[PDB]
Amino acid sequence: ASKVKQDMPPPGGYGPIDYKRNLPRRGLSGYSMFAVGIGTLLFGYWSMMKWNRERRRLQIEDFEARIALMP
Amino acid sequence: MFMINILSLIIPILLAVAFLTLVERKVLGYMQLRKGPNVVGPYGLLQPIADALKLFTKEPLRPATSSISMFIIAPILALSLALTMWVPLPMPYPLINMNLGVLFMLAMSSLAVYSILWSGWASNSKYALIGALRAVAQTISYEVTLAIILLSVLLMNGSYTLSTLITTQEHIWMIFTSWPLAMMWFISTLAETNRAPFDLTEGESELVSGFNVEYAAGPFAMFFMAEYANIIMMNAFTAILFLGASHDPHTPELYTINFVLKTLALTITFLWIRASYPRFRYDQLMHLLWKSFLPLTLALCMWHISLPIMTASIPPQS
Ligand SMILES: CCCCCCCC/C=C\CCCCCCCC(=O)O[C@H](COC(=O)CCCCCCC/C=C/CCCCCCCC)COP(=O)(O)OCCN
């Protein structure tokens, strides 16, 4: 006298299954990104300004060495 | 002794191209939840050798309707130019020291488009012709913008000498000064190397194989070698242009290691990009390069001309 055994869902039911789209925001604001970009640009401009002025002075020194050696 | 230097530049570049293909396959595989070549040699390290040996022992085909001279010449020109573009690069010392090295790369890159043009036209098949015309459109799209970007960036270097770029970036990377130009330069290098999402000349899903559809065995291998050598060369040029490694005159291999690491990072970024985006349409590529990149590039060219005078920051050289 064996009872019926068959593939059935568990008593109660199965757990919920997600189906809706899940695309989070995961980002900053436009103002923040623009601000960081401009800040990086300004820092780079300042550094290159100092470096290029120093390079101009070094080139002047090299040219003076050449001038002293020319005669 | 200069011949030995030529060989020491040429053979390692070809070796790096061969293994770049293995790296490209593995990176794409792991980004696609698979493994890629791991059977032919430990970790697939012998796969490029098997590919090279298979390709050069396979029968090369000469199409009946083809023009024989251009058909044979085009791959030779492609591979020779790809090898030639490496000679002025400072790592940290160039094999050839040019006053205008940047102009040299510009001219040779402009002459490398003819291998795809002559190959496609001399194949005398319809898909090859469509690929060649797509190459024409691609060059028309990117050339002017790339040249103006190069000029705007080099305005802060003071010359077209490539080694001077090391001196310019002794304290700071040029990407912190011209990141808006760096982004456009990176996209234009993707467009110039016929890489995804700008791989229209081949266009496997649309044109079967594009300009090289009729090529087989060794000539096809040379076209592939030229393309991947161009990838590595362009990324090395970008690394020199925007990420300047510090150079110690008594310790140059430190610079060499730094530069190679940056070049590998940029090449891996190329492979990463190929695995993430759909292909452009070639009219859409032309519109992107002429309606967005061109106006911004012109404005930034004016800005980078005015800025050094504005702040008294003109570079040294005449
Ligand atoms: C105080 C003043 C100083 C100067 C001021 C400067 C401020 C600059 C502010 C803006 C700078 C932005 C620069 C960006 C230039 C191009 C941006 C752009 O607009 O292009 C897009 C599109 O550009 C793209 O998206 C290209 C697509 C291809 C993507 C390929 C891979 C993505 C890039 C990967 C990362 C790149 C990393 C670059 C740096 C590497 C190191 C060099 C336009 O396309 P559409 O959306 O269709 O709009 C037009 C039609 N309505």
Curated annotation (Swiss-Prot), chain B:
Bilayer topology term: Multi-pass membrane protein
Main location (coarse class): mitochondrion
GO biological process: aerobic respiration; mitochondrial electron transport, NADH to ubiquinone; mitochondrial respiratory chain complex I assembly
EC code: 7.1.1.2
Keyword Transmembrane: yes
GO cellular component, one term: respiratory chain complex I
Molecular function terms from GO: NADH dehydrogenase (ubiquinone) activity
Disulfide cross-links: none
Catalysed reaction, written as an equation: a ubiquinone + NADH + 5 H(+)(in) = a ubiquinol + NAD(+) + 4 H(+)(out)
Location(s) in or outside the cell: Mitochondrion inner membrane
TM stretches of this protein: 2-22, 68-88, 100-120, 146-166, 171-191, 223-243, 253-273, 294-314
InterPro entries in the record: NADH_UbQ_OxRdtase_su1/FPO (IPR001694), NADH_UbQ_OxRdtase_su1_CS (IPR018086)
Keyword S-adenosyl-L-methionine applies: no
Record key words, sorted: Electron transport, Membrane, Mitochondrion, Mitochondrion inner membrane, NAD, Respiratory chain, Translocase, Transmembrane, Transmembrane helix, Transport, Ubiquinone
Quaternary structure note: Core subunit of respiratory chain NADH dehydrogenase (Complex I) which is composed of 45 different subunits.
HAMAP family membership: NDH1_NuoH
Protein task: Core subunit of the mitochondrial membrane respiratory chain NADH dehydrogenase (Complex I) which catalyzes electron transfer from NADH through the respiratory chain, using ubiquinone as an electron acceptor. Essential for the catalytic activity and assembly of complex I.
Family of this protein: Belongs to the complex I subunit 1 family.
Name used for this protein in its record: NADH-ubiquinone oxidoreductase chain 1
UniProt source species: Sus scrofa
Name of the gene this protein is made from: MT-ND1
